[PDB]
Design a protein around this nucleic acid. Sequence first.
DNA 1: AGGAACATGTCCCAACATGTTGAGAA
DNA 2: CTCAACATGTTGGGACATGTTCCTTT
Lengths: 234, 234, 234, 234
Amino acid sequence: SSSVPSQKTYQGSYGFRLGFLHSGTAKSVTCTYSPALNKMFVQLAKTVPVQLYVDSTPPPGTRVRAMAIYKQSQHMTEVVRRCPHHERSSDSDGLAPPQHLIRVEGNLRAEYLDDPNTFRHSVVVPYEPPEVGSDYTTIYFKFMCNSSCMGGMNRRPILVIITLEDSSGNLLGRDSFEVRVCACPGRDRRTEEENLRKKTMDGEYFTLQIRGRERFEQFRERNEALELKDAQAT
Amino acid sequence: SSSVPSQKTYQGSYGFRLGFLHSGTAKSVTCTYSPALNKMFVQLAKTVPVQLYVDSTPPPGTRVRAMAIYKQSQHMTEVVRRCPHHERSSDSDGLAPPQHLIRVEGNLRAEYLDDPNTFRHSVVVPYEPPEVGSDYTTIYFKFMCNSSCMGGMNRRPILVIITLEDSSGNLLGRDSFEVRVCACPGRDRRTEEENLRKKTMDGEYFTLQIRGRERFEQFRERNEALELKDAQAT
Amino acid sequence: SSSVPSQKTYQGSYGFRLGFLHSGTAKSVTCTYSPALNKMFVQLAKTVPVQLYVDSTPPPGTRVRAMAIYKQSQHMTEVVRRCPHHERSSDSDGLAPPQHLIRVEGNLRAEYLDDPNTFRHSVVVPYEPPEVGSDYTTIYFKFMCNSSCMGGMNRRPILVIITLEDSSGNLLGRDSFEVRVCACPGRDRRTEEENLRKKTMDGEYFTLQIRGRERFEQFRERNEALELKDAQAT
Amino acid sequence: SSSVPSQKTYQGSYGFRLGFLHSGTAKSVTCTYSPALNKMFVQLAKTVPVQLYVDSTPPPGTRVRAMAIYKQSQHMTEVVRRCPHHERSSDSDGLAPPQHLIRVEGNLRAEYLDDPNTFRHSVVVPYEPPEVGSDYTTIYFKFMCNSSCMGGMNRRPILVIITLEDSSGNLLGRDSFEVRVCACPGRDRRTEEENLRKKTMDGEYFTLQIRGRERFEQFRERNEALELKDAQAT
DNA sequence: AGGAACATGTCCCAACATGTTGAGAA
DNA sequence: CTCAACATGTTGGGACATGTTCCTTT
Ligand SMILES: [Zn+2]
Ligand SMILES: [Zn+2]
Ligand SMILES: [Zn+2]
Ligand SMILES: [Zn+2]
């Protein structure tokens, strides 16, 4: 009640920042990212690949930490955790405590923390350099609850904070993205981007006609992302 | 689960890449390759010839490893293995462990690895130069499970990664192709190449509103570029 | 797992049976009963009045027990309990254990049992005679979970069994009705009674062949005979 | 070893037979019996009990055997067990061996064991006299595998031998019915009755037009019910 | 407080998917 | 060694299910 985890973006000296795959919005997609809202839509307990980018390799012993907080200010001080139901269910993973919302997949060096003061949960992993011929590293997350789970997130939007820190635990970089765990990411995603379009519509716009639905959605995706970089330029 | 090995193409210092041009005559193969999908269609336990291309002769001790991973991101962290039924089968030649999906044929120097940290399976063979009169080295594989095997791949599409490495295991080159092990390769290939065609024969147009003159310029050219390349499907 | 308690109607020596005729005025109830389904629609934790009818006054020590079981046979063996979230709620009045779904209201003699052999839950109260001027005894229930509560009933229809017994617990009578705890009782009732109607109004003509002259007569004396008795919408 | 037991409808002095609740060819189900085929279509691990009926209720202690045997004149020797895949799947129920096809939940009297010589699988339960306020008995059946699982029944038909046997285990009854555990008991059921009735249909056949998809099923829940009561040619 | 208008998890079933079997082609 | 017909588990997404928000109403 006297300290909330900072969510201010910060590239730092290593140009740290995140990247995500490109997905559709079909009623079959299990995970899909919206550059228009910097928000990930994923089904319960399904893999969420997050790409980590760097301009220069960080010092030895650098770790990456994932932590979730509530987006709305009236809930910001409330620790995000699993609901009574899903909490009362153990998984093959004997590493992550049954109360943690975020898990890391395929990494036995992962470590789950319960802050003794803030009581906030978080999972940390060693920073690994990109594979030879690659420009980024990628971590695979999982969210063990539906944003709607009663007794848990209870329909409250959450934000995921990814920090890059050194052996001492000092901040080296930080980025973030919103998350919504739901039954149909495709549907929910289309709905939100649809409500966003019918809003910031004002001014002089050039018109480009595109052939094909897939090609169009890519062009539209790259377009809405650019309109975001401007949304907060001043 | 287990971390995901890189699947990014990397020709490296030797311009490493794969080829799939092996006639039907001589060792009448029942498999077939589709360049339109970069996917091979083969039957369970049947020879699959793959061509290795390199610009200059690699150093002494170079090897060639083969590893299979699940294509879809929600399965990428799961290790690709054989199904219980086929695993306990006696189709084992001794050299290859009963749990490996990928096998090398006609090479007694092949070594099968069951990683102790990533739990991933793979098979390695010493790199061999092309035959006198050829500019490529052939290698023969065998897939011990149907892509549909329950308990196994379970109808989940897989991707085979071929990496070139030095005696130590350092990456020198990498390439890959999709694989589907079925009972009727010819059929399944027609169907999939057919579904691919229908996907690029839909003439529906969409309009996009672009803000900023320069931006429009960039997007337009991007489109004209894809446009002046649409007329070639004949 | 747990054996399934009998749900067969048995009026017994006292002609025991239930009734659901309680006006809206006085204790304005938000629940509603559908005789066309013998199913009660009520909201979470809201009073549900039920009438007890008997031909002759029962012996001293007679009690009335209430037990809920899942309707569908594939769930019948699962004990009906509250969900984790609502179970840890503070809506507990003390008398009733936090895990019980069914509660008795306005009766401090009510006893809650958590069977040590069947693990089934139930609540009992001493049988009380009708009020001067009435031929039925009223009892008030409270359902502490929504039929949709995950971790709990999980959208699975339940059935409430009311049994009349002697001081020892021997069966003297039994009756029952279905129950659905939802947020909008009125709506859900209309929908279900509506789906019931459409089920008994289909107007598509199909064909049926027979291989006899006698037996045919029976299915002949009923066919063009049921299409007559329809003095409801004509 | 021995051989395959009888399956000739032999009620005996005590008489014996069973029954199944209402089951329509509607694909809106998870199980259904086709009297015109004597085949119990049911999904995987979905409880599907059968009614116990007996005129002269045998002496307490008597038991009802239930076994599975292939109806094909070549596999009748092979024991009916679970596929290698599902075998790994160790269900919570430790009462039934993780290799037995049949199960019976919510019944401590459940008996499971491997034959000492032939090494067969069987389940036996004590004939519980119709309890207070009833007239018959009901046991909860299951099938932990599909009739198509490879490494198991492998697309091979089976019969559930239900013979009432005294405490000792001496013959007393003999009833039976074929089973086809699948994923679509509805479709599958009709896809058989079709080709079934497709044969032998030349002669005097009256007509009858029934209006009402449900009524049609009602005139079928009796007419066809007499195709086993009137059709006594053999 | 009764009730459209959301918000959001499940279900239905016609495709679709895919190993079998078998008769015919070169 | 190719197709046609089957035999059979899985899927895609519109329809349905179901708690929540908030204006209009006694
Ligand atoms: Zn939850
Ligand atoms: Zn297999
Ligand atoms: Zn609840
Ligand atoms: Zn099986």
